[PDB]
């Protein structure tokens, strides 16, 4: 029954340090107007316009 | 870094070349000596 | 080689039962030790485990009622009852038993737990 | 935990004849960690077999013992007057510990 079979494990660690991270997610894309004031946020910087 | 093959007879030419980047490190170590490997055997 | 169980005996409910469970050339200190009992008219049920490492597991019913103790020059192990109780008669089989074969069981001292 | 009906409780034998002794486990047990050991009350228990595969010492290495499941057993090829105890079956797990109440062999 159960008791008795190959259970496949996977343990995953992580730790902080001064170096930077990495698998930070796949993140999100919109790309929604191109004529209209907006929020662009384009990889980190802030701002509105046209 | 940069590649110029501008060099004629000889000597450290007059001119201007400024430098791109390549590539960045995210290696935090304490540096404090430096060595070249001129690896001709 | 040889191994005696010797301090048991017939002490009051509620106190501290002391027992060493004593072997002669065969190094059992970093040896699996089990402890097991027997009930007047009931059959052997094991109650304690010590290993070579930090780690103690006990029986689901007595748990924290039992301190267990290893000599560290001589293999001797140094056994504590704590907060008896009179239907905790039974007399105390002490074992090297290993997980392949769990051989070279002892006789055990008789003992008997009331007022 | 582990369920171990060992069979018969009551024994009619005489030396020097063919006995098949029996203990029921639980629920599909192996056998490789099982420990098959002999009692005699009021004195030293002894040792069978470790895994029911290769016999213990002490012994003259006659007794078939082994199983699968829930079917362990052990033949002994010829009785002797000498093993008039009782036999105790059980099995390991490394985490969790069960005993098994032995089977009185008497005439």
């Known amino acids: 029954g159960v008791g008795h079979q190959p259970y496949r494990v996977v343990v995953l660690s992580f730790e902080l340090l001064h170096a930077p991270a990495t698998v930070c997610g796949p993140k999100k894309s919109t790309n929604l107007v191109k004529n209209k004031c907006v929020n662009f946020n384009f990889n980190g910087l802030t701002g509105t316009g046209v | 870094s940069k590649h110029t093959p501008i060099n004629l007879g000889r000597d450290l030419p007059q001119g201007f070349s400024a430098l791109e980047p390549l590539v960045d490190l995210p290696i935090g170590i304490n540096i404090t000596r430096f060595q070249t490997l001129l690896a001709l055997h | 080689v040889q191994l005696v169980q010797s301090g048991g005996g017939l002490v009051q409910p509620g106190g501290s039962l002391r027992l060493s469970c004593a072997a002669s050339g065969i190094t059992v200190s970093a040896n699996y030790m089990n402890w097991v009992r027997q009930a007047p008219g009931k059959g052997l049920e094991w109650v304690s485990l010590?290993?070579?490492?930090?780690?103690?597991f006990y029986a689901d019913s007595v748990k924290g009622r039992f301190t267990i103790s290893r000599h560290n020059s001589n293999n001797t192990l140094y056994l504590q009852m704590n907060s008896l109780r009179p239907e905790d008669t039974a007399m105390y089989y002490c074992?090297?038993?290993?997980?392949?074969?769990?051989?070279?069981?002892?006789w055990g001292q008789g003992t008997a737990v009331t007022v | 935990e582990l369920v171990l009906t060992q069979s018969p409780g009551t024994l009619s034998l005489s030396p020097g004849e063919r006995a098949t002794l029996s203990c029921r486990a639980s629920?599909?047990?192996?056998?490789?960690?099982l420990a098959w050991y002999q009692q005699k009350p009021g004195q030293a228990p002894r040792l069978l077999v470790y895994?029911?595969?290769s016999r213990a010492t002490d012994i003259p290495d006659r007794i078939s013992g082994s199983g699968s499941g829930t079917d362990f057993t052990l033949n002994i090829s010829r009785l002797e007057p000498e093993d008039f105890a009782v036999y105790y079956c059980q099995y390991s797990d490394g985490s969790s510990w069960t005993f098994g109440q032995g089977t009185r062999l008497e005439i």
């Open positions: 010590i290993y070579a490492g930090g780690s103690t």
């Open positions: 074992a090297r038993d290993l997980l392949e074969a769990g051989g070279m069981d002892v």
């Open positions: 629920l599909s047990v192996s056998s490789n960690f």
């Open positions: 895994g029911a595969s």
